Amino acid sequence: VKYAFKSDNLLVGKSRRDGVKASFKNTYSTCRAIKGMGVKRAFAYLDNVLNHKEIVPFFKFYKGVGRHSQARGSGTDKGRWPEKSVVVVKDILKQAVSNAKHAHKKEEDELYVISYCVNRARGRRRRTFRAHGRISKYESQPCHVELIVGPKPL
């Protein structure tokens, strides 16, 4: 009941993490960027994003995201380099690729990221002290990351 991608006899490996303490917005974009990529390209893309060589393009949460030179061909001028999100996503995509190799003996080359589902989660609710003796919230926005690897489109 925790996996969105309902399998349809495709023999595709799956991994996930629940209550990840990262931004939901900055993790959804990281997973959206890797979708459709061979897991070898995705590992080198995520590594490049950490070295700032490549950029995670933000298609949904773009308000306040700076336009950068690296996002020229992405389809959106806006983009960023989330570091905590990339570390988390890489772990899930390494577990997914390991699960698919052990379960169906697929090769890493013929595995492509096929589906993802980042959902919002309940956050740690710390407090923020405002002026005129008032207390507000500093609630986090954690995420349930789901990464699936599979043969290729068509």
Contact 40, 117 (CB under 8 A): no
Residue with tokens 């390494």: 94
- Alpha helices, DSSP H only, in 79-121? 83-104
Q: How far is the CB of 123 from RNA (least distance, A)?
A: 7
Q: What DSSP state is assigned to residue 66?
A: P
Which of 10, 11, 47, 72 binds RNA (CB under 7 A)? It is: 72
Known binding-site positions for Mg(2+): 129
- Site for RNA contains 150 (CB under 7 A): no
Q: Which of residues 42-71 bind RNA (CB under 7 A)?
A: 44, 48, 53-54, 60-69
Neighbours of 133 (CB within 10 A): 6
Spacing of C-alpha 140 from chain mean position: 17
Residue 110 has which token pair?
């013929």
- Site for RNA contains 22 (CB under 7 A): yes
Amino acid at 99: N
- Site for RNA contains 121 (CB under 7 A): no
Which of 11, 47, 103, 110 binds RNA (CB under 7 A)? It is: 103
Q: How far is the CB of 111 from RNA (least distance, A)?
A: 14
Residue with tokens 């990281």: 30
- Site for RNA contains 120 (CB under 7 A): yes
Q: How far is the CB of 79 from RNA (least distance, A)?
A: 8
Q: How far is the CB of 74 from RNA (least distance, A)?
A: 9
